[PDB]
Design a protein around this ligand. Structure first.
Ligand code: A1CM7
Ligand code: ZN
Lengths: 116, 342, 120
């Protein structure tokens, strides 16, 4: 047996946890702005985060600072896409979103951006 | 002790809701096209409040466009769900609105109120999944309630008026409604026969076939007669999935909000329940521990209650938390999951 | 806006991959004297019981959680796998035990599926 909506609903429940800031064990600092979340979810969506949190020394870090010049709006939108599988691209940010996805090693998102 | 106006506010949706002061009535016996929402499985009666929390893209877009243009939509009284065919419906009007963005999620909270009844000629589905229906609009005592003063006074009234009925039928229905609620105050029930009949029809805990049969009636006196009969024949409520189990009796129900014994509430997932409040339930089993988030009755903690010999979901517990509250224990039950018996 | 109907399954697959290697797992559940290690966040996203347990400020700090001893361990394992893979392994020889365990865990849709299959 397989559940058509189990994955989407589990993702929504994780997003509910994030919005309520429950058991969130890490905070990412991009452009001097903070975004709190869980390490497991981040490493499940990004090669960069997978590398960082599979590193036995860096996985203990509850605070992580990325490249400071990564656009904050792009990182926020990509985090929301991680937590809802939905990406709302727009004319005025697609380049920044693509650059941030490249930095995060999210190949499918970068490739999708290449098309638009 | 509990305030009886609080539940009607539906505070759990959100205290800040953009609100609209307005009303629009279509000329009777006119022909107009109305949009209807993708799935609304309830026979909405005029004057009855309806809360919704919508999620779908097309739903949010169409309701947004609605509130921009005309602020009303349609609710079809489906004779049966699977066939998706119906011949009457009710226009509902938006009177409270709010759009909520939650970390990429989008939802819309809304509260509406029924206005007019109508007959549907035919309905056509446009490309974007909205259904547009062509539709023709259907046309429409002593200050003290002391016993002896009402007795001789009503005899005198009957003698004088018919020396050669609306008030009498309304009075008897009000007597029954008061039997349900001692605290019931007359000024709350509208004096206009039409509004009173609609309010009573909404309060009645009855199945959908009777609901539509009552909605089609075009005269206030006929509604009052039919309601009188139904009220004075209803015996008890039984689990829909057992066909015979006493969950509640006629005398156990007690109004707890101005709307009446029964009202409409909404779930965190957008599904709508019609809840009926009673201070005594039988053959129900509790699962879990008390919770209070998104509670329908502020100050009370709900616990799911399942038909214990049926394993089907029926109602909730609603135990008060503070120990100065009069109803330290009552129950809510879902009308959709139980049927009248006789 | 656009949608990735497989991204959620990919995330679940990555989480199951981490579980299979016991990486960042922070809780152990004891069912029928048998231990199963997992993450609290996933558990509370799939079970109301774990949601209540880990939303309780006193009990969320617990690294070891013991359930009702008489709950089927095989059903618990299958339900954990379903949590981590969107896949439920029902058979005639366990369906009732799985339904009972799901009811104990307060997993609505799982019990709904069990009821749907039992009705047939
Ligand atoms: C915030 N929050 C949350 N946040 C984060 C997480 Cl992580 C999380 N997890 C979780 C928990 C428990 C699950 C579960 C997932 N799943 C999904 C599992 C899977 C695999 C499909 O994902 C599943 O089945 N259970 C049991 N739940 C929940 C809070 C409670 N809340 C709720 C509140 C009120 C009512 C009412 C009535 C009652 C009477 C009244 O007066 N008011 C009402 O509205 N009815 N209902 C239905 C209510 C539901 C639901 C959301
Ligand atoms: Zn039953």
């Amino acid at each position: 047996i397989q559940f058509t909506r189990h994955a989407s609903d589990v993702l929504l429940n994780l997003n509910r946890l994030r919005s309520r800031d429950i058991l969130t064990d890490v905070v990412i600092v991009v452009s001097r702005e903070q975004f709190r979340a869980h390490k497991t979810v981040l490493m499940a969506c990004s090669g960069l985060f997978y590398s960082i949190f599979t590193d036995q020394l860096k996985c203990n870090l509850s605070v992580i600072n990325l490249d400071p010049e990564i656009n904050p709006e792009g990182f926020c939108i990509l985090l929301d896409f991680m937590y809802t599988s939905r990406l709302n691209l727009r004319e005025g940010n697609i380049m920044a979103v693509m650059a941030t996805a490249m930095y995060l090693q999210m190949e499918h998102v970068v490739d999708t951006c290449r098309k638009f | 002790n509990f305030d009886t106006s609080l539940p009607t506010s539906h505070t759990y949706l959100g205290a800040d809701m953009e609100e609209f002061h307005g009303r629009t009535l279509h000329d009777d016996d006119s022909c107009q096209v109305i949009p209807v929402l993708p799935q609304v499985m309830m026979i909405l009666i005029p004057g009855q409040t309806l809360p919704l929390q919508l999620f779908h893209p097309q739903e949010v877009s169409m309701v947004r466009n609605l509130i921009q243009k005309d602020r009303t939509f349609a609710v079809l009284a489906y004779s049966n769900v699977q066939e998706r065919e119906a011949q009457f419906g009710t226009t509902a009007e938006i009177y409270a609105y709010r759009e909520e963005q939650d970390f990429g999620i989008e939802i819309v909270k809304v509260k509406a109120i029924g206005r007019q009844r109508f007959k549907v000629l035919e309905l056509r589905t446009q490309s974007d999944g909205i259904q547009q229906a062509k539709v023709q609009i259907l046309p429409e005592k002593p200050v003290s309630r002391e016993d002896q003063c009402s007795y001789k006074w009503w005899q005198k009234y009957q003698k004088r008026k018919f020396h050669c009925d609306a008030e009498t039928l309304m009075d008897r229905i009000k007597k029954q409604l008061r039997e349900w609620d001692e605290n019931l105050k007359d000024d709350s029930l509208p004096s206009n026969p039409i509004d009173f009949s609609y309010r009573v029809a909404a309060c009645l805990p009855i199945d959908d076939v009777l609901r539509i049969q009552l909605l089609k009636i075009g005269s206030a006196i006929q509604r009052l007669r039919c309601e009188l009969d139904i009220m004075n024949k209803c015996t008890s409520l039984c689990c829909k999935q057992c066909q015979e189990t006493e969950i509640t009796t006629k005398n156990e129900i007690f109004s707890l909000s101005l709307c009446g014994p029964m009202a409409a509430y909404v779930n965190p997932h957008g599904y709508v329940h019609e809840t009926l409040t009673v201070y005594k339930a039988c053959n129900l089993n509790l699962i879990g521990r008390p919770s209070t988030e998104h509670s329908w009755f502020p100050g009370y903690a709900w616990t799911v209650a399942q038909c214990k010999i049926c394993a089907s979901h029926i109602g909730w517990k609603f135990t008060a938390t503070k120990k100065d509250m009069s109803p330290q224990k009552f129950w809510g039950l879902t009308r959709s999951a139980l049927l009248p018996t006789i």
